Amino acid sequence: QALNTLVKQLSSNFGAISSVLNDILSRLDKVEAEVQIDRLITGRLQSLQTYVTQQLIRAAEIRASANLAATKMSECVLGQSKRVDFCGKGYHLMSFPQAAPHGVVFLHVTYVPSQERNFTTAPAICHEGKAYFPREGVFVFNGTSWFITQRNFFSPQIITTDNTFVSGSCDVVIGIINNTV
Amino acid sequence: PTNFSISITTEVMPVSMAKTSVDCNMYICGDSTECANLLLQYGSFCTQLNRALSGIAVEQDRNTREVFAQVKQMYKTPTLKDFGGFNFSQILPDPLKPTKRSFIEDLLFNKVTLADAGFMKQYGECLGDINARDLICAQKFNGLTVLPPLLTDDMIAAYTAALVSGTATAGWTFGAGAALQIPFAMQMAYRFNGIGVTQNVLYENQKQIANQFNKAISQIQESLTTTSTALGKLQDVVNQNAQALNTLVKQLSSNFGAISSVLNDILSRLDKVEAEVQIDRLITGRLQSLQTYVTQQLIRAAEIRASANLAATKMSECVLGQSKRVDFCGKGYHLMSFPQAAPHGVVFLHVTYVPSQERNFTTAPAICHEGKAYFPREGVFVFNGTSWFITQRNFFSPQIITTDNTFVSGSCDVVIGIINNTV
Amino acid sequence: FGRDVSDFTDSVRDPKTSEILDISPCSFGGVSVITPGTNTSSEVAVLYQDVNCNVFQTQAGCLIGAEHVDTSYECDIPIGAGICASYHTVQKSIVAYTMSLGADSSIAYSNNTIAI
Amino acid sequence: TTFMLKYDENGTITDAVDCSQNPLAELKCSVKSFEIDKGIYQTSNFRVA
Numbered sequence: 088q089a090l091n092t093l094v095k096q097l098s099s100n101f102g103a104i105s106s107v108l109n110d111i112l113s114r115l116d117k118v119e120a121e122v123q124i125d126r127l128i129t130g131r132l133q134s135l136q137t138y139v140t141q142q143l144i145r146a147a148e149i150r151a152s153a154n155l156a157a158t159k160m161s162e163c164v165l166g167q168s169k170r171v172d173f174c175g176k177g178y179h180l181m182s183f184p185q186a187a188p189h190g191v192v193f194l195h196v197t198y199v200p201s202q203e204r205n206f207t208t209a210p211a212i213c214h215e216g217k218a219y220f221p222r223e224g225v226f227v228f229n230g231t232s233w234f235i236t237q238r239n240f241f242s243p244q245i246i247t248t249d250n251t252f253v254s255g256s257c258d259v260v261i262g263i264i265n266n267t268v
Numbered sequence: 269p270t271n272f273s274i275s276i277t278t279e280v281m282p283v284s285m286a287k288t289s290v291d292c293n294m295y296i297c298g299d300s301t302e303c304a305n306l307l308l309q310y311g312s313f314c315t316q317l318n319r320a321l322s323g324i325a326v327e328q329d330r331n332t333r334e335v336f337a338q339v340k341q342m343y344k345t346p347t348l349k350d351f352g353g354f355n356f357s358q359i360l361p362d363p364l365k366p367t368k369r370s371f372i373e374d375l376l377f378n379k380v381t382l383a384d385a386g387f388m389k390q391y392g393e394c395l396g397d398i399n400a401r402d403l404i405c406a407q408k409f410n411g412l413t414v415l416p417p418l419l420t421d422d423m424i425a426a427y428t429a430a431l432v433s434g435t436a437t438a439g440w441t442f443g444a445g446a447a448l449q450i451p452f453a454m455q456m457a458y459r460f461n462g463i464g465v466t467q468n469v470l471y472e473n474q475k476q477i478a479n480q481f482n483k484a485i486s487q488i489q490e491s492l493t494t495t496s497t498a499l500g501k502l503q504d505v506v507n508q509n510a511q512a513l514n515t516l517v518k519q520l521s522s523n524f525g526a527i528s529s530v531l532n533d534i535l536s537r538l539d540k541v542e543a544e545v546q547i548d549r550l551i552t553g554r555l556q557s558l559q560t561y562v563t564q565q566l567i568r569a570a571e572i573r574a575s576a577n578l579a580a581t582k583m584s585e586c587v588l589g590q591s592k593r594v595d596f597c598g599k600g601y602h603l604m605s606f607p608q609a610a611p612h613g614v615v616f617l618h619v620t621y622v623p624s625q626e627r628n629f630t631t632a633p634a635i636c637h638e639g640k641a642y643f644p645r646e647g648v649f650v651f652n653g654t655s656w657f658i659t660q661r662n663f664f665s666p667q668i669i670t671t672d673n674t675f676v677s678g679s680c681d682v683v684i685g686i687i688n689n690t691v
Numbered sequence: 692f693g694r695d696v697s698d699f700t701d702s703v704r705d706p707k708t709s710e711i712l713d714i715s716p717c718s719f720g721g722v723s724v725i726t727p728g729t730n731t732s733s734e735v736a737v738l739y740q741d742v743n744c745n746v747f748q749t750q751a752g753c754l755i756g757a758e759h760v761d762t763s764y765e766c767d768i769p770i771g772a773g774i775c776a777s778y779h780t781v782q783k784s785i786v787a788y789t790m791s792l793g794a795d796s797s798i799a800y801s802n803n804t805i806a807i
Numbered sequence: 808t809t810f811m812l813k814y815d816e817n818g819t820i821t822d823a824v825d826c827s828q829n830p831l832a833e834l835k836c837s838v839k840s841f842e843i844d845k846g847i848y849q850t851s852n853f854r855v856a
């Protein structure tokens with residue numbers, strides 16, 4: 088569109104008698120036609136300068152987009168990224184780059200949890216008088232007893248000394264439900 | 269470190285500017301009905317300017333849509349505003365309040381002194397009370413208008429309220445498609461788990477942390493009410509957007525090589541042939557002025573778009589999850605963030621974790637037990653004063669050295685500084 | 692005569708009957724055209740920016756040629772101030788409505804239960 | 808008045824629009840085309856004679 092506009096801008100009288108030369112030069116002598124020729128030159132030079140300025144302004148944004156695309160390639164394609172909503176909507180696993188006309192298309196493979204389940208829980212458990220805080224995860228009430236599982240997948244596990252660490256007593260923490268390890 | 273503090277910082281980022289449009293046929297060649305014949309001969313120089321200005325108008329709405337409209341579910345207000353002692357009031361909207369914005373957002377909206385383009389300046393208002401010499405009435409007479417944004421201030425406030433409610437209730441889970449309910453207690457415990465410290469500190473000092481959080485919120489409120497130059501980056505946008513239009517208006521009194529700068533005077537003293545030269549000169553000058561204005565507006569729009577992209581990225585990272593990037597969200601260790609609306613911008617409230625009190629400890633790289641080196645599992649051994657203990661790097665929590673918190677590798681000859689002890 | 696900050700005569704004393712008269716431009720305001728597309732239909736909706744005025748008043752101005760609709764769809768033609776227009780079967784016509792921000796949803800907050 | 812004329816591959820005039828009959832025609836004159844896609848466009852401001 089920019090090139091087409093520049094082409095169609097050649098039929099404008101920039102204060103001259105006519106917009107087409109070889110007509111001013113055919114009806115007027117050397118001295119008189121020079122003024123109109125200079126007017127046309129000034130107008131067309133202004134048009135060219137405007138086109139160049141717009142092209143530079145567009146090139147700035149294109150360069151910014153190219154830098155963003157290169158960064159996303161180097162991060163998602165060549166490794167696993169832990170940035171939220173950077174590579175794909177969800178939890179990033181891997182990515183595949185694909186070529187495109189004047190661009191690049193990324194295919195992001197992600198991990199999305201689907202089905203939920205209600206569970207009542209407690210911050211900690213009192214065994215013999217000392218608090219047993221979780222190592223990693225949250226205790227849950229599966230329905231019969233207490234179990235410890237991760238936050239991303241329901242995998243019930245028996246509570247033992249390996250998956251919990253002891254610290255303090257059962258007085259400061261609020262919500263300590265007694266159980267066994 | 270032996271003690272910690274909770275600090276809340278503020279970050280101001282513009283997201284969009286004033287959306288404007290120009291009618292060249294009225295700015296240049298105003299109501300002449302004879303010059304307009306010469307304006308057609310100069311070419312279709314106006315379509316390019318209007319098309320360039322429409323792209324900025326679309327982009328300034330795309331920016332606002334990208335920055336705020338990130339959550340698809342519009343969660344309601346939890347109507348509790350007190351989760352485990354953490355007072356969430358003054359951030360979420362209050363139902364028994366006229367405006368739909370919270371107290372902090374109202375304070376932010378009160379700081380910025382907008383030019384107040386009413387978006388409905390009728391002919392009756394600009395035809396009477398002319399002694400006031402309002403700038404806006406002078407701009408609209410010359411074909412310079414300001415379009416209203418697509419998203420009103422109420423919808424942006426609702427978006428921020430939904431984001432804050434989801435952060436308070438769902439937590440970090442709503443960054444994905446679904447949202448998992450969790451109390452604010454173990455959510456903060458998990459945030460304290462990914463920072464480096466254990467979950468013991470929160471469940472033991474919840475009262476102090478809640479008190480510090482409330483005091484930080486109150487101090488932020490007092491700073492917002494007291495400080496004069498806080499939303500300077502947002503005020504500058506309005507100050508330049510109005511200044512450009514005022515300069516364009518006052519540029520209409522320049523003789524671009526003609527006898528006079530005001531038409532209907534050249535047309536009244538000169539015949540058709542002689543006045544055409546001066547009319548063409550004036551048209552050329554005013555068209556150059558319009559092109560310069562459009563170019564400057566595009567250059568400003570580039571920077572505004574970059575700032576909007578940065579704001580959207582920071583929202584998606586800090587607001588919808590915990591970021592492990594140094595000095596990205598807030599000065600310190602990131603815990604959580606809260607977004608707040610602002611005139612032509614967004615304000616982030618970053619909750620961070622800062623160690624406060626230090627303590628000297630002499631240490632050793634490893635310990636020799638029976639002839640084999642016992643390297644740390646995670647942390648550094650310390651000399652508490654009576655014996656040797658192992659503790660984390662972010663909080664002094666002495667622990668007895670056992671086989672669980674250390675791993676055996678090599679012998680006691682290569683490592684330098686092995687001090688003997690027992691496990 | 693009189694002049695403005697931009698060279699233009701605004702006040703002229705009447706030769707006869709000296710009395711000072713104000714001169715103001717005849718044209719003032721703004722108008723936009725909303726069209727569903729030439730291929731689909733030739734009807735258009737005109738929106739005037741600065742008027743009080745099937746008319747229907749918006750925060751942007753008075754919009755004519757379209758019908759008001761009380762249900763909220765998504766936005767396809769972004770009119771200012773939260774209003775949007777679309778071609779709907781009401782024969783078809785242009786209908787104006789407020790854009791829908793999102794899907795309403797509520798989550799119960801409990802201090803003892805979690806979702807895994 | 809102001810008109811827009813259309814020339815086919817041959818040297819003939821087959822259609823024309825008036826830049827003041829309808830606002831849609833004014834918009835077509837502004838964009839210099841006979842087909843308009845969907846959307847909202849900004850034409851010249853309201854003028855009084």
Ligand SMILES: *[C@@H]1O[C@H](CO)[C@@H](O[C@@H]2O[C@H](CO)[C@@H](O)[C@H](O)[C@H]2NC(C)=O)[C@H](O)[C@H]1NC(C)=O
Pocket residue numbers: 270271272473476
């Ligand atoms: C860490 O410092 C905090 C304050 O930042 C101490 O908690 C209380 O702070 C208030 C307010 O300054 C004082 O009035 C109390 O006396 C403090 N409580 C005490 C000294 O028991 C806190 O004690 C400090 N230490 C720890 C381990 O958290």
Ligand SMILES: *[C@@H]1O[C@H](CO)[C@@H](O[C@@H]2O[C@H](CO)[C@@H](O)[C@H](O)[C@H]2NC(C)=O)[C@H](O)[C@H]1NC(C)=O
Pocket residue numbers: 350355356357358
């Ligand atoms: C959360 O903070 C708000 C705002 O400060 C508290 O509301 C104030 O509460 C005090 C103490 O009861 C009253 O004297 C004020 O009149 C209240 N102000 C307003 C504007 O309502 C609110 O009580 C706090 N919530 C708590 C501590 O649970």
Ligand SMILES: *[C@@H]1O[C@H](CO)[C@@H](O[C@@H]2O[C@H](CO)[C@@H](O)[C@H](O)[C@H]2NC(C)=O)[C@H](O)[C@H]1NC(C)=O
Pocket residue numbers: 706707708709
């Ligand atoms: C110019 O002549 C007109 C003729 O109408 C004058 O207007 C009249 O002025 C007299 C007083 O001089 C009034 O009583 C009449 O009512 C006016 N008539 C009208 C139709 O307005 C006018 O005053 C004269 N101006 C000067 C400067 O002498």
Ligand SMILES: *[C@@H]1O[C@H](CO)[C@@H](O[C@@H]2O[C@H](CO)[C@@H](O)[C@H](O)[C@H]2NC(C)=O)[C@H](O)[C@H]1NC(C)=O
Pocket residue numbers: 815816817819
């Ligand atoms: C323009 O003139 C051409 C040439 O006559 C017309 O197109 C057809 O051209 C073929 C040869 O390529 C002739 O055999 C046909 O007779 C022409 N058709 C007709 C209907 O004459 C074309 O139709 C003309 N366009 C107009 C009149 O709009």
Ligand SMILES: *[C@@H]1O[C@H](CO)[C@@H](O)[C@H](O)[C@H]1NC(C)=O
Pocket residue numbers: 203204205799
């Ligand atoms: C969990 O329980 C809540 C409260 O009764 C209910 O609204 C929700 O639908 C339940 N979730 C599932 C996955 O059953």
Ligand SMILES: *[C@@H]1O[C@H](CO)[C@@H](O)[C@H](O)[C@H]1NC(C)=O
Pocket residue numbers: 229230231232
């Ligand atoms: C709890 O786990 C036990 C393991 O034996 C299982 O039998 C029981 O059904 C579970 N309770 C539920 C699913 O409510």
Ligand SMILES: *[C@@H]1O[C@H](CO)[C@@H](O)[C@H](O)[C@H]1NC(C)=O
Pocket residue numbers: 261262802803
């Ligand atoms: C949870 O809140 C309810 C009121 O909604 C209260 O009765 C109960 O004691 C609370 N539980 C805990 C563990 O704090």
Ligand SMILES: *[C@@H]1O[C@H](CO)[C@@H](O)[C@H](O)[C@H]1NC(C)=O
Pocket residue numbers: 213263264265
């Ligand atoms: C756990 O044991 C303590 C100490 O005997 C007792 O006070 C408490 O009621 C028991 N139950 C729970 C749910 O904490």
Ligand SMILES: *[C@@H]1O[C@H](CO)[C@@H](O)[C@H](O)[C@H]1NC(C)=O
Pocket residue numbers: 626627628
């Ligand atoms: C630790 O010891 C050094 C060296 O004597 C001293 O400069 C510093 O102040 C001490 N730090 C604390 C927290 O006491």
Ligand SMILES: *[C@@H]1O[C@H](CO)[C@@H](O)[C@H](O)[C@H]1NC(C)=O
Pocket residue numbers: 652653654655
């Ligand atoms: C070392 O720890 C012991 C634990 O019993 C404590 O009594 C002693 O004061 C500590 N030494 C210090 C603090 O210098």
Ligand SMILES: *[C@@H]1O[C@H](CO)[C@@H](O)[C@H](O)[C@H]1NC(C)=O
Pocket residue numbers: 684685
């Ligand atoms: C530490 O440096 C001092 C000199 O400053 C030296 O005497 C000492 O041996 C060094 N200690 C170790 C463990 O290398």
Ligand SMILES: *[C@@H]1O[C@H](CO)[C@@H](O)[C@H](O)[C@H]1NC(C)=O
Pocket residue numbers: 636686687688
């Ligand atoms: C530790 O034991 C080794 C082996 O007997 C001995 O050489 C060394 O002096 C002892 N002390 C320290 C501080 O390494």
Ligand SMILES: *[C@@H]1O[C@H](CO)[C@@H](O)[C@H](O)[C@H]1NC(C)=O
Pocket residue numbers: 743748
């Ligand atoms: C303009 O219209 C509004 C309704 O949109 C009406 O309330 C108001 O009175 C009108 N303003 C004037 C100045 O007539």
